[PDB]
RNA sequence: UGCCUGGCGGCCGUAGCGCGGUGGUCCCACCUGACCCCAUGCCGAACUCAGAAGUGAAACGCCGUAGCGCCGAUGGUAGUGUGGGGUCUCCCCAUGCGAGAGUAGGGAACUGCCAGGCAU
RNA sequence: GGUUCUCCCCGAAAGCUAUUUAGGUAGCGCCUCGUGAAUUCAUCUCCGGGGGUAGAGCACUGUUUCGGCAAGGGGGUCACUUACCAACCCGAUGCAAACUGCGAAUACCGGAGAAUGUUAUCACGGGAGACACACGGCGGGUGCUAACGUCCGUCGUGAAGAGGGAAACAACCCAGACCGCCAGCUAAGGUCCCAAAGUCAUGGUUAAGUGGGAAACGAUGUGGGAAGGCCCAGAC
RNA sequence: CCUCCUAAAGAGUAACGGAGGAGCACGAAGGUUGGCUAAUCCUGGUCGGACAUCAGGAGGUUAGUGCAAUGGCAUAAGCCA
RNA sequence: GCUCAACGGAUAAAAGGUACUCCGGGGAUAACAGGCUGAUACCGCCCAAGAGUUCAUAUCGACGGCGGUGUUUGGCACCUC
């Protein structure tokens, strides 16, 4: 039947890019699935939000046999 | 470094905002304004963005 | 899945969690004929201490290399060698095998000998 | 025996290649072997009338780059989308 | 009359028809009818041209149609204001960029293929050229 | 020090698949037995325990091999930021950036810790 | 609808959100005044990032044509067979906003550094206006790649901007007017006369007043270029 | 209110633009420990057929996810105790 | 304990008629005419299967193609409420 509907934009995406200094707890990426996976010092929330578990620099990296994206936190 | 002279050659009217920001970065005020600046790559980057409207004398 | 691949799959989750926690792990390997034990540093690329039934010094005082008694011997051996190098706190990695029989005998022996897990 | 005259390219890229075509000339490449690939320019009319003959794509051709002679074979041809013109030729060392 | 048998979606955004064609070579027959222009070919134009060239070769040889009208075209009727939803699909077009080989033929002498293509070209909204098969 | 094997990693197809060959003293595997520890929505297949009569058949490791995967230039082409222009649905020029596909070619992995067998 | 003396400084908006709201109002955005605070902010350079867009491609999701091979459906059997149709698979060829085994240019986030910029930045407090936008460029949706149409994004100008050019002509091009000058140089655009400046120089093209409106298509119009067929064994 | 595209590769972005869905369910369909791995096609097999259950091979997640879409998911987030 | 779903919810509580009409406003917004546009319309051409005993173009002309006008049916809401 008729169209006309759409939902509110969920403001997902990368909140802190590579090199950015973050304090423990800071959301690095809001995503729907695990487009990025949690690496060293990075936690994964119930809505697959990746967050900092320790103060430091955001590091993006491709690891493993499945060539997956990982967000980690390097000490600064 | 060495000193160079830059002169605005065309009007800033109608130019992209970023280009107006660049002319402010060079301290160029009006058409024909010649200015003495240090020949560094940062000054040479600014000159390059607004190349169409400045003349350089080395 | 074939026996080996099926076992590695069974072992992957715990090993990744141990990697994440940065824990020193006591890795056990089992075979019909032999039982092995290695204490691997959190990096996972270097062995601190090891003991097995392929070792002439251990197999000599044992009836059969692939039984619960041999497993208890390998267990006592790693813990003793680990404690001589100052390694006290570890995390047991059953490596896809059930925590039972031979694997259990090795872990109960290491616990007895003084290893903390 | 097809004999193609060529000069070495003093420039490379979009700007420079388009300037050749406007000047009734076209870029081409010579590659293969231990030797480094040679970026060359060809006269459009001359090569165009040559490639009209089926033998051009089968036979071993000789490219004359500043005196020197190079035995090659036509590897690939980039033609104009709708005009009877040549855009670029790949020559492989024979 | 050519048309997709089924489609994921009924209607499609207008879009643009920029760039040069893909499929610029006689890949199946001996001769071709290449587009020199840019435009849309309707399913009716494609059929009209196909019929003309077929009659020309007296249904000898083989014909290939390298284009497919997979683009749905909508239209608002008379006495209808703007808005109130996208119009209804009326016809199907194939976007044509310069270089597209539209039709291919073989099994006929060059002179005949040239005439057949001259006759079909007159039914098309865009400028064409006769093309022959090439060795690479 | 060399060769071989097992474990745990690095790396994540130049590393994989296929095809051919090859290895059992040791290791590994199949294997033997099963009342029992333990197990099967049934089954000792798997999990598991007690072993050593047999075999490298399978698997696994190694060696070879470009059928496939994979890596991949150079050159040209497509696009595009800025400035300019035309016949302005689309293009062109100056300048900077510059693919994707294809082509030549590469390619039958490389590497660390520990342990065991053998040899000098 | 109207709102009355003067000069000076700064200087918007026609957006978002909510609204019995839609030509009203409120918070935020943007303006102004004040207080305070860091090299706070901008440009550029070098360094650290994530893209899935343009383009491309066709393994995936669909769609599409040709060839090869073919389970299966339709008609004769009284299981066998056929000038039919034919998914999958292989080779070849395209198409995609809601396809991606690829993938830019830009843009954006972060770090450091200089120069420049009347703090341009942030916070708090006083005072607002404004929430009808318009055209032009680029990227799109809608419509007919119709509209001086309509709806987003982004930049420019008008709005709130005079001067020169585009005959005239908010929104295009050049350029931002504190005041005086019967000085000079330039921009866009121009230089035969109206009308300031070349009846300038040099080399070509056109003969249509083309220039100074318009397409498919048509034609021994004329200039340049590369090739070819026939021909003194006599071509046209 | 939710999902995708329009949306111009950060976020956001309009129209009576293009397509769909929600106004619930579940004491297990939640927690944990231990285990397990689909779709589809080919071959063989009582009744049994194009398709039920059984066996082997190819395949490799195209399946599955209480439900729309998109992003995820094998260390499974899928399936069992 | 509200499908206060008009979902930031005016009340616990509410449908219509006016050609008998009235006021404040708007060309912010329709009807006439102008304007922009030209899908539609009207006029012309390009191609030529075929009709025309024979022969495409005497006269016509299918499948399709390109324009001109501002001129019908419309679109828009720029001018005048
Ligand atoms: Mg360029
Ligand atoms: Mg067994
Ligand atoms: Mg073997
Ligand atoms: Mg490059
Ligand atoms: Mg690249
Ligand atoms: Mg490439
Ligand atoms: Mg490739
Ligand atoms: Mg090779
Ligand atoms: Mg050794
Ligand atoms: Mg001011
Ligand atoms: Mg209300
Ligand atoms: Mg960088
Ligand atoms: Mg595209
Ligand atoms: Mg086929
Ligand atoms: Mg303030
Ligand atoms: Mg309002
Ligand atoms: Mg408004
Ligand atoms: Mg607007
Ligand atoms: Mg308008
Ligand atoms: Mg106003
Ligand atoms: Mg004037
Ligand atoms: Mg004069
Ligand atoms: Mg005229
Ligand atoms: Mg004669
Ligand atoms: Mg976005
Ligand atoms: Mg963007
Ligand atoms: Mg579940
Ligand atoms: Mg588990
Ligand atoms: Mg069967
Ligand atoms: Mg409301
Ligand atoms: Mg009244
Ligand atoms: Mg009006
Ligand atoms: Mg009217
Ligand atoms: Mg309007
Ligand atoms: Mg009027």
Curated annotation (Swiss-Prot), chain A:
<protein>
    <recommendedName>
        <fullName>Large ribosomal subunit protein bL27</fullName>
    </recommendedName>
</protein>
<dbReference type="InterPro" id="IPR001684">
    <property type="entry name" value="Ribosomal_bL27"/>
</dbReference>
<keyword id="KW-0687">Ribonucleoprotein</keyword>
<dbReference type="GO" id="GO:0003735">
    <property type="term" value="F:structural constituent of ribosome"/>
</dbReference>
<dbReference type="GO" id="GO:0042256">
    <property type="term" value="P:cytosolic ribosome assembly"/>
</dbReference>
<dbReference type="InterPro" id="IPR018261">
    <property type="entry name" value="Ribosomal_bL27_CS"/>
</dbReference>
<comment type="subunit">
    <text>Part of the 50S ribosomal subunit. Cross-links to the 23S rRNA. Cross-links to the A and P site tRNAs.</text>
</comment>
<keyword id="KW-0699">rRNA-binding</keyword>
<dbReference type="GO" id="GO:0001558">
    <property type="term" value="P:regulation of cell growth"/>
</dbReference>
<comment type="similarity">
    <text>Belongs to the bacterial ribosomal protein bL27 family.</text>
</comment>
<dbReference type="GO" id="GO:1902626">
    <property type="term" value="P:assembly of large subunit precursor of preribosome"/>
</dbReference>
<keyword id="KW-0694">RNA-binding</keyword>
Swiss-Prot record, chain B:
<comment type="similarity">
    <text>Belongs to the universal ribosomal protein uL30 family.</text>
</comment>
<keyword id="KW-0687">Ribonucleoprotein</keyword>
<protein>
    <recommendedName>
        <fullName>Large ribosomal subunit protein uL30</fullName>
    </recommendedName>
</protein>
<dbReference type="GO" id="GO:0002181">
    <property type="term" value="P:cytoplasmic translation"/>
</dbReference>
<dbReference type="GO" id="GO:0003735">
    <property type="term" value="F:structural constituent of ribosome"/>
</dbReference>
<comment type="subunit">
    <text>Part of the 50S ribosomal subunit.</text>
</comment>
<dbReference type="InterPro" id="IPR018038">
    <property type="entry name" value="Ribosomal_uL30_CS"/>
</dbReference>
<dbReference type="GO" id="GO:0005737">
    <property type="term" value="C:cytoplasm"/>
</dbReference>
<dbReference type="GO" id="GO:0022625">
    <property type="term" value="C:cytosolic large ribosomal subunit"/>
</dbReference>
<dbReference type="InterPro" id="IPR036919">
    <property type="entry name" value="Ribo_uL30_ferredoxin-like_sf"/>
</dbReference>
<dbReference type="Pfam" id="PF00327">
    <property type="entry name" value="Ribosomal_L30"/>
</dbReference>
<dbReference type="GO" id="GO:0000027">
    <property type="term" value="P:ribosomal large subunit assembly"/>
</dbReference>
From Swiss-Prot, chain D:
<dbReference type="InterPro" id="IPR011035">
    <property type="entry name" value="Ribosomal_bL25/Gln-tRNA_synth"/>
</dbReference>
<dbReference type="Pfam" id="PF01386">
    <property type="entry name" value="Ribosomal_L25p"/>
</dbReference>
<dbReference type="GO" id="GO:0022625">
    <property type="term" value="C:cytosolic large ribosomal subunit"/>
</dbReference>
<dbReference type="InterPro" id="IPR020056">
    <property type="entry name" value="Rbsml_bL25/Gln-tRNA_synth_N"/>
</dbReference>
<protein>
    <recommendedName>
        <fullName>Large ribosomal subunit protein bL25</fullName>
    </recommendedName>
</protein>
<keyword id="KW-0699">rRNA-binding</keyword>
<keyword id="KW-0687">Ribonucleoprotein</keyword>
<dbReference type="InterPro" id="IPR029751">
    <property type="entry name" value="Ribosomal_L25_dom"/>
</dbReference>
<comment type="similarity">
    <text>Belongs to the bacterial ribosomal protein bL25 family.</text>
</comment>
<dbReference type="InterPro" id="IPR020930">
    <property type="entry name" value="Ribosomal_uL5_bac-type"/>
</dbReference>
<dbReference type="InterPro" id="IPR020055">
    <property type="entry name" value="Ribosomal_bL25_short"/>
</dbReference>
<keyword id="KW-0689">Ribosomal protein</keyword>
Swiss-Prot record, chain E:
<dbReference type="GO" id="GO:0005737">
    <property type="term" value="C:cytoplasm"/>
</dbReference>
<dbReference type="InterPro" id="IPR020798">
    <property type="entry name" value="Ribosomal_uL16_CS"/>
</dbReference>
<dbReference type="InterPro" id="IPR047873">
    <property type="entry name" value="Ribosomal_uL16"/>
</dbReference>
<dbReference type="GO" id="GO:0022625">
    <property type="term" value="C:cytosolic large ribosomal subunit"/>
</dbReference>
<comment type="subunit">
    <text>Part of the 50S ribosomal subunit. Cross-links to the A and P site tRNAs. Interacts with assembly factor DarP(YjgA).</text>
</comment>
<comment type="similarity">
    <text>Belongs to the universal ribosomal protein uL16 family.</text>
</comment>
<feature type="modified residue" description="(3R)-3-hydroxyarginine">
    <location>
        <position position="81"/>
    </location>
</feature>
<dbReference type="GO" id="GO:0000049">
    <property type="term" value="F:tRNA binding"/>
</dbReference>
<keyword id="KW-0379">Hydroxylation</keyword>
<keyword id="KW-0820">tRNA-binding</keyword>
<dbReference type="GO" id="GO:0003735">
    <property type="term" value="F:structural constituent of ribosome"/>
</dbReference>
<keyword id="KW-0488">Methylation</keyword>
């Amino acid at each position: 039947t008729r169209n006309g509907r759409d939902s509110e934009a969920k403001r997902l995406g990368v909140k802190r890019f590579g090199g950015e200094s973050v304090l423990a707890g800071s959301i690095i990426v809001r995503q729907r699935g695990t487009k990025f996976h949690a690496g060293a010092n990075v936690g994964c929330g119930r809505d697959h939000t990746l967050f900092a578990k320790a103060d430091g620099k955001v590091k993006f990296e491709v690891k493993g046999p499945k060539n997956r994206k990982f967000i980690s936190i390097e000490a600064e | 470094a060495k000193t160079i002279k830059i002169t605005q050659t065309r009007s800033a009217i109608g130019r992209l905002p970023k280009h107006k920001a660049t002319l402010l970065g060079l301290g160029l005020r009006r058409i024909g304004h010649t200015v003495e600046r240090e020949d560094t790559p940062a000054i040479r980057g600014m000159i390059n963005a607004v190349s169409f409207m400045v003349k350089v004398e080395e | 899945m074939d026996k080996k691949s099926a076992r590695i799959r069974r072992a992957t989750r715990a090993r990744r969690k141990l990697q994440e926690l940065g824990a020193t792990r006591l890795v056990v390997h089992r075979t019909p004929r032999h039982i092995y034990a290695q204490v691997i540093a959190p990096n996972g690329s270097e062995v601190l201490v090891a003991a097995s039934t392929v070792e002439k010094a251990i197999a000599e005082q044992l009836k059969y290399t692939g039984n619960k008694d041999a497993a208890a011997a390998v267990g006592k051996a790693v813990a003793e060698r680990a404690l001589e190098k100052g390694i006290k706190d570890v995390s047991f990695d059953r490596s896809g095998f059930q925590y039972h029989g031979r694997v259990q005998a090795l872990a109960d022996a290491a616990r007895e000998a003084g290893l903390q897990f | 025996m097809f004999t193609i005259n060529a000069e070495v390219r003093k420039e490379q890229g979009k700007g420079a290649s388009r300037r050749l075509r406007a000047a009734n000339k076209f870029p081409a490449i010579i590659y293969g072997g231990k030797e480094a690939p040679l970026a060359i320019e060809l006269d459009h009319d001359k090569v165009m009338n040559m490639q009209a003959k089926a033998e051009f794509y089968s036979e071993v051709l000789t490219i004359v780059v500043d005196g020197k002679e190079i035995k090659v074979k036509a590897q690939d041809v980039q033609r104009h989308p709708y005009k009877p013109k040549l855009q670029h030729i790949d020559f492989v060392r024979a | 009359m050519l048309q997709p048998k089924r489609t994921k979606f009924r209607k499609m955004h207008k879009g643009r028809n920029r760039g040069l064609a893909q499929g610029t070579d006689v890949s199946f027959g001996s001769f071709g009818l290449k587009a020199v222009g840019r435009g849309r070919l309707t399913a009716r134009q494609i059929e009209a041209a196909r019929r003309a060239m077929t009659r020309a070769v007296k249904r000898q040889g083989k014909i290939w149609i390298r284009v497919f009208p997979d683009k749905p075209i909508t239209e608002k009727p008379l006495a209808v204001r703007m808005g109130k939803g996208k119009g209804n699909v009326e016809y199907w077009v194939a976007l044509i960029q310069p270089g597209k080989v539209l039709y291919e033929m073989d099994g006929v002498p060059e002179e005949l293929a040239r005439e057949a293509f001259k006759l079909a070209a007159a039914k098309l909204p865009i400028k064409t050229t006769f093309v022959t098969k090439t060795v690479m």
